[PDB]
Amino acid sequence: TFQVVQENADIFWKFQRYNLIVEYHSRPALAPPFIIISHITQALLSFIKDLLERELPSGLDQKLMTWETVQKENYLAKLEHEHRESSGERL
Amino acid sequence: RLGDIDFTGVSRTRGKFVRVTSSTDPAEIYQILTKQWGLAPPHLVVALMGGDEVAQLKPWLRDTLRKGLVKAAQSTGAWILTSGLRFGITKNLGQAVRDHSLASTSPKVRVVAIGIAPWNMIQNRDLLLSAKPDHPATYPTEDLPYGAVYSLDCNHSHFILVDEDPKRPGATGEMRVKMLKHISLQRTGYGGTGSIEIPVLCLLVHGEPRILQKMYKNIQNSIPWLILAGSGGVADILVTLMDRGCWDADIVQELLINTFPDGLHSTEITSWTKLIQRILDHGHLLTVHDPEQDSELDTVILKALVKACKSQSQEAQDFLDELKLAVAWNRVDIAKSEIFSGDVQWSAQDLEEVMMEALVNDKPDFVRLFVDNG
Amino acid sequence: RILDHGHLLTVHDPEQDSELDTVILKALVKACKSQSQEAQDFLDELKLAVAWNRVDIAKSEIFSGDVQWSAQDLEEVMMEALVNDKPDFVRLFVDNG
Ligand SMILES: [Ca+2]
Ligand SMILES: [Ca+2]
């Protein structure tokens, strides 16, 4: 079971590590029991008044989608090329 | 006369322009392009002729054409001279150039799309007539049918607006030919204390009989020409007449009639047949690009340039810029088959410069070739 | 006289052909090509080629350049090729206008 499971276990760990790292975005920097200070501060700020998931300006967003399309075209061209000079296609 | 454009529409693009007349010298416009706008002297110039007719190319043909042109121009710094009006193949090539510019991670190399358009065929020229240096003029980009007057292409970075000549309403093609000759006669510095010509090529897509005089004048000016296979018009006539091998008055007239029903006049058709026959009689400046079989635009450009210069002269020092362009495209096979074929004597001093640029630019195959060749 | 017609005659050799739909398509395309040059008549041969998934014959004989294909003419055959799970003809029609 170890020999046949290790790889899928590692992939699952990477997926879980994503969520674990995302959990720290809203997590206060103070550990318990000092986290009561952070909880009170946030509650008071809410009552009185991220690296991930960012919105970009229109120009940069268009540039990035154009770059993505160019990279996809390169990927497809490389796939079709490595298919075209394969041994079976040559035969 | 100099100005700037703030294109309003799909994308906000900043473009410049110059208003010129048929009386101005091309050298002044070249100096403006080099200095006043910061455009470095290119390693390749590709002129676009035709493609403004009612019938546009098939989507696959124009896509493969634009992709091949942009990929061949990105290895070096090249100008793609177009008719800077947003319609048809010019619009598609401008869009491809803009896409390459946006997707490029290296800004040192630049593919510049320069538009040479008449003043009397532009939408809303009065809007840009002011061109305040402090506040650039704003231009709305409108898509239009074939019509008779177009709008400036937004994706074209720079423009050269030619003013209509009262004597003859054909100053646009005349100025295009004059500029093609002038850049073809430039000698940019090569490495250190070296003189390198600028290779200048003309590509024809779906030509019309009206541009035969301009095409012949570019043939006279030693400008190699490249012909698309399935372009549709004069390109089909030229490729058929090349495949047949022998062109006569009857064949040329019959093909012109079959492709162009409209032309029915003894003098006009006779002049067009004479132009076709003489252009084919040149021959060595003419090349056929068939994307269904070629699939490599840089290869056919290199072959056309090598054939043109090989017919021009035999000395090694003239193949220097074709060899540099082959180095930039990593076309070692063509270099050893056509340039290093034994018909040309290569010394060590001649090969030293190209050795230096091949060694600097990460081209091991050419390093090995130059070590093997002296 | 039958041989003098010729263009309406096709030979199927199963020892060498091994594809009856291919030779039927070729015979129909040749017959209609001799009949007329307009694109609107190749419409049913093109539909039959779509149904048989003969993209090679369609691009070699129908989309050969001798016939001018517009967008309105290709719209219907595009619709039936897209509905009937024929991606190759979808790509061909997108590439042809
Ligand atoms: Ca030369
Ligand atoms: Ca029919």
Curated annotation (Swiss-Prot), chain C:
Entry binding sites for Ca(2+) 1: C32, D41, D44, E45
Domain of life: Eukaryota
Location(s), subcellular: Cell membrane
Subunit structure: Homotetramer.
Domain notes: Contains two Ca(2+)-binding sites that are allosterically coupled. The binding site in the intracellular domain modulates the voltage dependence and the accessibility of Ca(2+) in the transmembrane domain.
Family, similarity comment: Belongs to the transient receptor (TC 1.A.4) family. LTrpC subfamily. TRPM5 sub-subfamily.
Job description of the protein: Monovalent cation-selective ion channel activated by intracellular Ca(2+) in a voltage- and temperature-dependent manner. Mediates the transport of Na(+), K(+) and Cs(+) ions equally well. Activated directly by increase in intracellular Ca(2+), but is impermeable to it. The activation mechanism of TRPM5 involves a multistep process.
Entry protein name: Transient receptor potential cation channel subfamily M member 5
UniProt lineage: Eukaryota, Metazoa, Chordata, Craniata, Vertebrata
The gene coding this protein: trpm5
